[PDB]
Design a protein around this ligand. Structure first.
Ligand code: NA
Ligand code: NA
Ligand code: NA
Ligand code: NA
Ligand code: NA
Ligand code: NA
Ligand code: NA
Ligand code: NA
Ligand code: NA
Ligand code: NA
Ligand code: NA
Ligand code: NA
Ligand SMILES: [Zn+2]
Ligand SMILES: [Zn+2]
Ligand SMILES: [Zn+2]
Ligand SMILES: [Zn+2]
Ligand SMILES: [Zn+2]
Ligand SMILES: [Zn+2]
Lengths: 140, 140, 140, 140, 140, 140
């Protein structure tokens, strides 16, 4: 056995979605106060940038940390759940957990981990809600 | 009189909004066929980039095509109508004109022209629905 | 009849390709002198950004200058010819016209025009050879 | 004779400079009112993005609108005048014309035109004072 | 008690400032040699990008690592000290510590920490002096 | 002695290169299957973004983690080996190690470390093969 160099591989994609920040554990007034304009009753939306970062040994034969073709398919499966959708209304997960970008990052990390051929190399998910507001999550 | 150099001045801002592409002049099936995933019943959303381009003589005293402080205020007035809103439900204009980015560009151009201290220098509006889909409008 | 507002619609994609700048109408020395490091005998490469800009009346029913789904398919047909290829060796056109980005812009414009469902709205092609070197072409 | 396709070629570079917006034709109070925080007595600064756009026939032999190596040298000559400098204090031109980005665009266009091997193809200069504030100039 | 997922939240803003790199502990010649063109006597300037990264448990009710509205106000307080200013002349801190971007990152981190409602979640500051030169600091 | 604040300094540059992903330890069919379109026999290419990140104590006199002028020269030496070249054919290293971006990141890290005046501060190399595919390496 010979341990190979450890490298990271990150793949960037995006999805467009609507949402409204509204907690079922808060009153109407509290939701307005906590979430401000993000609580607009008819919602608003974002192009979310999703970056998926893997870390692992370089394979000596393929030269890859992970098969990009395989990652593309797995990421597509996750993106299908959220792209051109309303997070709070169309995605079961967000019925019971507020759709802040913190919680979106967690959702995407966990859903991806659930579909991956080799989930052990999943290292970090990034969600950019806008170019100015960036969230990351590395799991438990 | 002495005509001064003609220069353009462009200012970039953004707004987050939800929408759904659905024409009242189309059947449900036709809307699905025309608009595809963009017709998702609960909508989706974008961070829209708005660029406002002015063209005019440079003022010999101030060195400006237009007062940026004034433009910022006028652009804010327009952005207030759409930011963190649902275009089709919250903005009267989109009740009767489909919220394609073509029509958003027209809306923003016309609304801005309506609030400007000097609307004669308004030259072009750009809307980037995503980084990959860009629309421009120069008026009548 | 009622002429509708004229708007532009631009769609951005990319392709990765190898090339070498070498004219069959120049000597070896002249090619080295004209093209410098771009004449490296084993070639070099770029991620080329391709932007396709259309201009036309907004449709009153669909709200679109052109059907994006249709454009995506037509652009794919063109991109298939160049993506992950060697321009000078794999693309017949470049056997007899030097693969400068000027000539790539012309190639992509003409090939796209050749496959378009409605080529009359094609307005401009942009090729970014790198983020710093940008070329555009509007046809004859 | 055979007229060749007309293509544009644009090259992007940058320079870092300090400035203060202050007109000798305005009083202290007027300068404060016209220029606001831009009139800060000790100045402020920008990374200015400079884009130089040329337009002309493609050469049948070289495939180029202009020799990029030559443009790089000519642009360097202009950039030497402004990079890591204070516009108002170090550049003679700005002693008598206010250093607004409108006037910077004009300055760079004219200075470049003055050093170019083939100035007839110079088509447009862009200055981005910040990513949000963009100016262009096409000459007389 | 139940420990919640740990997520990062990063907010990006910018400021324009002039500076000159000049150490009071170096001779004129040494300053020229150490700092080169950055020692230009009348200074130069940058649009500095500032990114503020927080790390902490997601709140189960609000879904947030930190209140963005609160962060915006706190970051504004820091930005007021440097925006449209000359670092070395207008900001007391830089009279006695050289205004390299390393030291700017430290300054902004410490000043922000000093005004924060909950400074325990401050994790990292980034300063981009230009798009090509990036500095980060995580405190003591 | 007094330990100074630890800060990172990162410098971004780029190079254009051709390559083909093909392992000498795989059959023709296996190479096609492993590498797909990346195995195109005449190759393809990328503008690779290279970021070089250093980490170390801030110098109390210069205010720098490292001399940028020195880093620029050292990075140039590495870039000379790959810019406007074919990785697999022109660079000895890639004759025996597949030119995946994982292995490019390792190559650039090790080659830079080999030429650095102070290699102890080298912390991380990033290679962006395209804007969507990003690799990093921190050494052994
Ligand atoms: Na909302
Ligand atoms: Na975003
Ligand atoms: Na929809
Ligand atoms: Na956008
Ligand atoms: Na070559
Ligand atoms: Na490019
Ligand atoms: Na000032
Ligand atoms: Na800028
Ligand atoms: Na200076
Ligand atoms: Na910057
Ligand atoms: Na290949
Ligand atoms: Na890249
Ligand atoms: Zn939101
Ligand atoms: Zn949409
Ligand atoms: Zn090339
Ligand atoms: Zn300024
Ligand atoms: Zn500086
Ligand atoms: Zn490749």
């Amino acid at each position: 056995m010979f341990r190979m160099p450890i490298v990271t591989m990150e793949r960037v994609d995006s999805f467009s979605a609507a949402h409204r920040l509204h907690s079922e554990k808060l009153s109407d007034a509290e939701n307005k106060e906590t979430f401000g304009k993000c609580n607009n009753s008819n919602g608003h939306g974002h192009n979310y940038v999703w970056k998926v970062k893997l870390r692992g040994e370089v394979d000596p034969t393929s030269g890859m940390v992970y098969d990009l073709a395989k990652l593309k398919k797995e990421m597509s499966l996750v993106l299908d759940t959220v792209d051109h959708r309303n997070l709070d209304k169309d995605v079961e997960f967000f019925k019971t957990t507020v759709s802040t970008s913190e919680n979106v990052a967690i959702y995407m990390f966990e859903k991806l981990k659930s579909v991956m051929s080799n989930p052990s190399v999943l290292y970090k998910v990034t969600i950019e809600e806008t170019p100015k507001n960036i969230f990351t999550y590395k799991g438990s």
